[PDB]
């Protein structure tokens with residue numbers, strides 16, 4: 001079965017490109033990462049940095065999570081990310097997304113032993 005850590009990697013990691021993310025990037029990525037299978041996931045961020053660099057965020061700046069939990073961490077450096085947001089006209093199963101590339105600090109929640117990212121909270 002898929003671990004929480006593995007799900008984070010599937011949903012949020014894309015180390016292969018520096019940013020490139022064509023205007024088609026989210027339409028393609030959201031489907032293939034299985035985020036459009038049961039419904040159109042409304043909002044999802046992919047991070048274009050090495051796995052070790054994203055894992056390292058769990059030992060960086062501790063900040064409150066949006067839900068009030070205390071186990072969120074903000075990257076000291078900006079990171080290459082792509083935000084995917086479902087369009088107004090998108091209708092399941094034809095999930096359609098706007099693709100927006102940015103360099104921002106990421107905030108992730110970390111859990112477990114080993115202590116690793118399990119949830120993408122925000123970018124700032």
Ligand SMILES: O=c1ccn([C@@H]2O[C@H](COP(=O)(O)OP(=O)(O)O)[C@@H](O)[C@H]2O)c(=O)[nH]1
Pocket residue numbers: 011043044045066119120121122123
């Ligand atoms: O900048 C963002 C904001 C949210 N999400 C995703 O959207 C999901 C829904 O957000 P959350 O679980 O924190 O609850 P909500 O924001 O919907 O109240 C998150 O788990 C993330 O997978 C994301 O990928 N990037």
Ligand SMILES: O=c1ccn([C@@H]2O[C@H](COP(=O)(O)OP(=O)(O)O)[C@@H](O)[C@H]2O)c(=O)[nH]1
Pocket residue numbers: 004065066067068069071109110111118119120121
């Ligand atoms: O602010 C948060 C939000 C979520 N989680 C944990 O992150 C994991 C993945 O979250 P979820 O299953 O809700 O999926 P997501 O919303 O991130 O897509 C779960 O073990 C939650 O306990 C957390 O530790 N802090």
